[PDB]
Subunit: 370 residues, 3 copies
């Protein structure tokens, strides 16, 4: 009924067992053709129990992962290097396609929640995970090669190769339980957020001062610019918005960015306004819950009311030179920038009346829903 809204139910789990699960949202362009531009963006949500490890793999997709909740140790490896990072909530990490990575929940009793945006390299909207080891969920890709090839490659008997690499490990699946001793082994090397062979360092989305901030909300944003060259390559921005309970983000829009937003935490109500076929204004609404996804098309006015402390994670594509533009309040209010005489000709009220009404809201960006 609301094509911009993707409830957690629209996620299907790809890997899942007692230790956690890897869920993947449906392709956006399958929902509606108005998301064709988002066709090559898939949202992944990973949940892992304490002292749990997502086994090594690579995908034929480029990735940015962000910690929604908890604490992780994420490792990235290419042909000649490995780096392990301790990631906290609101930290992001780029994982280039074809690099191996694995994810440790390094917490004793808190669950790990991770959000990923995957951008397939080969087939628009489609990617696969490639595990070097076998498990009950999937075989090692090494099994795809012949006996002769494997033996020549590893310089060893097929029976040894099969015994140590190819068999199913002693079977949980791709997310396994890890002993305290093993956990400490895996975190000894990790470094915390605060380059080499395209293994780039983690980004702290909440680094420094928020772009927008008052008593009712904060918006943090990491833009595609000199400070983050890799975001330039992707033409993406990463945004973290926190809306206090009982507060509202004023009607606003991104001028050119299209944003996929996931609800990291909290509840609230989405209003999204659109013009469609002489021309009618359509209102779309949704009750936001943790794990939900929604799409903010560029230049479509949006307002969001927080039922409880609301944490939203935004992946913005087509982000270069984006402006986040407001329709009420003092700062960033584009309606205010219309010339007085133009306001007078456009609106029912006089220019004076329009300009007065506009000055009623003394605050900017976020205000109380009261």
């Amino acid at each position: 009924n609301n094509p911009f809204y993707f409830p957690s139910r629209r996620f299907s789990t790809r890997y899942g067992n007692q230790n956690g699960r890897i869920r993947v949202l449906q392709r956006f362009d399958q929902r509606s053709r108005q998301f064709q531009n988002l066709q090559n963006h898939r949202i992944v949500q990973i949940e892992a129990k304490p002292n749990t490890l997502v086994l090594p793999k690579h995908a034929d997709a480029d990735n940015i992962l962000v910690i929604q909740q908890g604490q992780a140790t994420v490792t990235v490896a290419n042909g000649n290097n490995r780096k392990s990072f301790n990631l906290d909530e609101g930290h992001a990490l780029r994982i280039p396609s074809g690099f191996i990575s694995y994810i440790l929940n390094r917490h004793d009793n808190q669950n790990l929640r991770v959000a990923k945006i995957s951008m397939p390299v080969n087939t628009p909207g489609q990617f696969e995970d490639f595990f070097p080891a076998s498990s009950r969920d999937q075989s090692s890709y090494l099994q795809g090669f012949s006996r002769n090839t494997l033996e020549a490659a590893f310089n060893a008997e097929f029976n040894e190769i099969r015994r140590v690499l190819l068999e199913e490990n002693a079977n949980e699946g791709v997310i396994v339980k890890v002993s305290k001793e093993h956990v400490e082994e895996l975190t000894k090397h990790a470094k915390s957020v605060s380059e080499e062979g395209d293994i780039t360092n983690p980004i702290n989305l909440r680094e420094g001062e928020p772009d927008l901030s008052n008593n009712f909300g904060k918006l943090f944003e990491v833009k595609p610019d000199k400070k983050n060259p890799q975001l330039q390559d992707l033409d993406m921005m990463l945004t973290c918005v926190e809306i206090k309970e009982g507060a509202l983000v004023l009607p606003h829009f991104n001028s050119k960015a299209m944003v996929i937003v996931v609800v990291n935490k909290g509840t609230g109500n989405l209003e999204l306004v659109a013009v469609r076929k002489n021309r009618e204004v359509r209102r779309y609404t949704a009750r936001l819950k943790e794990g939900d996804v929604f799409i903010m098309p560029a230049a479509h006015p949006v307002a969001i009311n927080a039922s409880s402390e609301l944490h939203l994670l935004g992946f913005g594509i087509n982000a270069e030179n984006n402006h986040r533009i407001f329709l009420a309040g003092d700062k960033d209010n584009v309606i205010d920038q219309i010339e007085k005489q133009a306001k007078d000709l456009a609106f029912p009220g006089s220019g004076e009346q329009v300009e007065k009404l506009i000055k009623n809201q003394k605050e900017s960006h976020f205000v109380s829903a009261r």
Copy 2:
């Protein structure tokens, strides 16, 4: 019958009243699949009566507008800034998606004609205009929000909000403006003559010296390069060609740019040559059209084109995939690629000898544009 030709009839009007109209060309890829690469480019033509104003709005499309005829005052506003520009014929202005703009015909008695290329951001080939105010043509998008949201947002009673912002002001989206209002809207208008929050200055397409020029024609071109960084972002070039009455642009093509051209003024005849399969044996196909003001046509890359002017012909060209494009000619002295073929190669390829081919080629002493006699 000619898929490259789009007569003014193929425009449908989206907004229209006594004061003018906003017309939009059909999606190019709906005509034919050979225009799939142009799918995200829509042509808009705006006509406005004197002392008339196209009301504030933004689109979910990136825009370049060009004055085809008359004089305008165009205002662009974002979240923290506003700039107003006096634009004359042949002046272009970039309006980023989501920025508000409005268009004043500041002339007392001459109509304003404006051409726009719109490139949708969300849905390939589709965009919508978003008006903050209501009118008989459309509701304010502010009406899409709830009473509670509006009241909290504006810090005011819904009744006041509805009274001053939400009600219908009626005329439509293009309204009549009093002389006094007109003078108010033009009072701080800039006349930028050269480049100077992503509110970029107007471009003069006829700035400086034309690329090509003789007694029969001129071609002006603004290329995607350091001088116009925004054209680099778009990988686009803007071209203005003026062909004298009774003159002909020589057979030629763009090496890699695809060009959407609109006929700003005049009449003429288009010849476009494509190679098409009837695998096996393929044939040369000739496409023609009688060009009239307001017509659009597509110049696919590397397809030879010639244009004969029935009367002073002004053509506006929006070139995509423009970087490192070469406009290459098939006759005449300068830019003639056939001339660059080695003499021995000419001899082997053509029916005549190398000497005969080279002599025939030297007959045309002129370049680019010649008399249709």
Copy 3:
């Protein structure tokens, strides 16, 4: 069609062909399978020409990189104001921008010429046409597409002279013609061998220039990457790769991290193993093919691949999405990513202990290429 990544020479269809040679074009990749949609705008052309033979002047509405697979050529590139002729040997590559005229001389007395081309259409995804200025039994001159009046005004001559020297069929063989020894020497007299660039006529690239990236007794891999040294490869975001695998040797399981590669077999025979993870009809799928000269296959990014040479195997690779690509190995010493997994992670992932995994991995002391025995 059992292995969608493999394209045997039979899947090429000849577009132009006669006694002197033939121009063959591979089917569109996305018509085979939708997993090749990203390769939709890349067509593979294979040209074969007899000794002292010339492929007649033409341009395409496609961008092109050509590479000499075998023999020796003189290739000429012409735009509106310039011409350059290049002597190209095996493993030399040349960029031919769309809309530029080019022709290809087999300058050898008795060896055949084989040329591979990657064409990227400008107008219509996956589709392009060749535009010949001259007529032949295979195609008419595009100049015939223009009217008598236009031609006469353009060339400043009688239509009868124009038709006689330019438009008639040059008894006609086709687009590949025989050339006399004297004509051949005429065409090679100004050819350069592998100077400052000029009007986007860029110089030839030697794929085997300098030192190979990977090299040992069993194989070599040469690569030209999109970087400052080859600005035009940057524009294309492409890499060009030349791999030579000794008879009886194997390229270790490996993959490109992000590049998608179209590879053509220039010479030799071998066996392809390509591993894909896929959804059950999650399972590992093995694809194989017997490689022969003229075959094409697709290496999707991040899909493990191993290749066994039945005889000296020369592979030419066109890599798209190439920037920051890493060629990553799954066995051997250097570039082995499995080796980079932490010991404790190896232990948790694999059936063996970390120590056992790390020992087994050190068995193969060599890198990249090893003996198939």
